[PDB]
Structure formats: C-alpha cells, structure tokens
C-alpha cells in the first residue's frame, strides 16, 4: 500500500481531484496536465499513477504499455443478480444526434454540414463516426468532409476547430479538456443544442441526461427530447428512445489505466476509495462523491455506479475488442 497519484486533465478536474485528495487523507494525490495525452505521458514517466480513459485513449495508452485496471459500470441495463463491482460492463451506444427541426438531415446528407465532436481520438465523438465516414467516402480527407466542426484536439486554426468556443474569456479554443465549452459528451451535445453544429457525435446516455429536466444547467434546462433525432446508418431518423436500433456502434466503457507494475496497487486503492465516495459510499453525499460533478463528467462520467473488476485480466486489445482495435488502426492510417 501507498499513495495513488491521479492525473487530472485540466483545471476543473484538478479541483475535483484536490477535493478527493483532501477527503481521502492524501491516500490519493493529484498531478494535472492540459490534455489526456499529456496525462498518459506523466503516467508513463511514473509521475502519475492512473486516470480514467475513453476507449480511444485506452488504445493510445495501451500501445504505450499501460493496462486497463477497472472499468466504469453504469446503472445496469441487464437485470442482474450480481454486485456492480463484479458485474460485466455492457458498453455504451455511440450515436449521431441532430435537431428534429433540421428536417432534411440524415446519415447520408452529412457532407458539408457542421459537426460537434467530444474530442479527436475519442470513441463515440471521433473514431466511430470518422472511421465510418472515411470508409464510406473511400477518402482519408476526413478533415474536409464537414464544412466546420468543433473537434477538441485538432489544429486550432483548422476547420475542425472553427466551431469550438474556448473558455469563459474566450481563451483555449479547441483545447481537449473541460475548459473548452464544447468539450466532451456534454460539450458536444451543447454544441448541437445551441445550434452551433448540425450533428453531435456522443453517446445515448448524453441526450437523456441533458434533456427534459435531467440537467438544470442554463443551456440544458429547456431541452426536450422530442426536439432531437438519432441518425441511423440505414439513412433513417429515429426518436432518441430508439438508440438500441439506431446507433453507430457499441463502445467499450471508459476505464482506469495505469502502468502494469502499479496496476494491482491502483486497483486496491480505488476499490476502497469507492466504498467511501462512490454510490452509497460511506461519505457520499455528506463529504464527497467521486462520481458527481454537476454533469461535467470530471474524472469519471457522472452516470457511473461503480468501477468494476475486469474479467480475464484483459490486455488493452482484449478490453477494447478486436473489431474496435482494427477500426482504430484503419482510421489511424489516414494520419
């Protein structure tokens, strides 16, 4: 046993991490970087122990030798008989969302439209949709498909960043961290909600959690699910209640990664930390809730019920699944 150094991406995650550190009595301390890739590097250098990552980032981390430790597990879809920590993870639904009022828009008329992405390299926001588009257009010029986009992590002066807004002060336009107004699941959905973009590439859960009163945030408090539609691959449009039959793919759950030589220890500490601050945790809500951050999904997605043990001590390729790994590989050929 020892202290686990978490890596926070950006100043807001840093703040939440500091609160967690304080409440844990320094059982967890914080390192902070401006981007997920920088955090991946801190971990590789041994300057940080771990962080929770989207599948696309797990691919980057895995290539560099980091391993998955525990996976996010949400309010179980499959009516189970096992505890959350032991429950297998199902995966989330990557979807393409548009405004119902934007009537002519389908998967087949996306070219030259405006797009909102969680961030370059992320599963639902980038790898799945751009991999599909590259494949279908038979062209690697995915940076010329949409007329403008907000794809945090791309070149700030490029069309891929044209729609990004930066922070309060209008600084950090397109940075791949929560300071960018349209970053992540909620940022990309907001980009759609405010009609900055024509389509948003997020997950099923994002639409639900930010509509019909689920979010009191000012830009989301008035959003109605009926005002949105999902784009299915067969060219049809469906209500957001049909994500099961109208998604782009099933994505592997975000998961915690660490150096192989620190994995066992990181796992031990996290399992204990969630007993304290997770859902129903001894000290949540009274003191600190590890899986809450007012829909900002800081450190962990807010809809996380618990971090679950993995089956079969999977390598990053096994955790992500061969198909997805090859999909990423294929897309990477373009850059």
């Amino acid at each position: 046993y020892t202290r686990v150094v978490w890596c926070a991406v950006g100043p807001e995650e840093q703040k939440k991490c500091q609160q967690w550190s304080q409440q844990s009595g320094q059982n967890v301390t914080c390192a902070t970087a401006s981007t997920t890739d920088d955090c991946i590097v801190l971990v590789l250098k041994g300057e940080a122990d771990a962080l929770n990552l989207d599948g696309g980032y797990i691919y980057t981390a895995g290539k560099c030798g980091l391993v998955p430790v525990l996976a996010e597990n949400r309010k179980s879809s499959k009516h189970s008989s096992l505890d959350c920590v032991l429950r297998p993870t199902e995966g989330y639904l990557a979807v393409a969302v548009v405004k119902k009022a934007n009537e002519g828009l389908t998967w087949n008329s996306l070219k030259d439209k405006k797009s909102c992405h969680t961030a370059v390299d992320r599963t639902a926001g980038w790898n799945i949709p751009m991999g599909l588009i590259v494949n279908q257009t038979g062209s690697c010029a995915f940076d010329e498909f949409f007329s403008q986009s907000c794809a945090p992590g791309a070149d700030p002066k490029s069309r891929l960043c044209a729609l990004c807004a930066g922070d309060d002060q209008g600084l950090d336009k397109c940075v791949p961290n929560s300071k960018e107004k349209y970053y992540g699941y909620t940022g990309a959905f907001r980009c759609l909600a405010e009609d900055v973009g024509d389509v948003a590439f997020v997950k099923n859960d994002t639409v639900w959690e930010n509509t019909n009163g689920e979010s009191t945030a000012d830009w989301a408090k008035n959003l109605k699910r009926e005002d949105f539609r999902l784009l299915c691959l067969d060219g049809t449009r469906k209500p957001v209640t049909e994500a099961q039959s109208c998604h782009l793919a099933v994505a592997p759950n975000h998961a915690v990664v660490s150096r192989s030589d620190r994995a066992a220890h990181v796992e031990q500490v996290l399992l204990h930390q969630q007993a304290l601050f997770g859902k129903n945790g001894k000290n949540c809500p009274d003191k600190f809730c590890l899986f809450k951050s007012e829909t900002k999904n800081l450190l962990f997605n807010d809809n996380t019920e618990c971090l679950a043990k993995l089956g079969g001590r999977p390598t990053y390729e096994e955790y992500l699944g061969t198909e997805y790994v090859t999909a990423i590989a294929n897309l990477k050929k373009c850059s």
Binding site: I40, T60, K63
Partner: peptide, 6 residues
C-alpha cells in the same frame, strides 16, 4: 501505426 506514439 503500431508502436507507442510517444
């Protein structure tokens, strides 16, 4: 397209 991007 196969080693660590760092």
């Amino acid at each position: 397209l196969e080693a660590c991007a760092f």
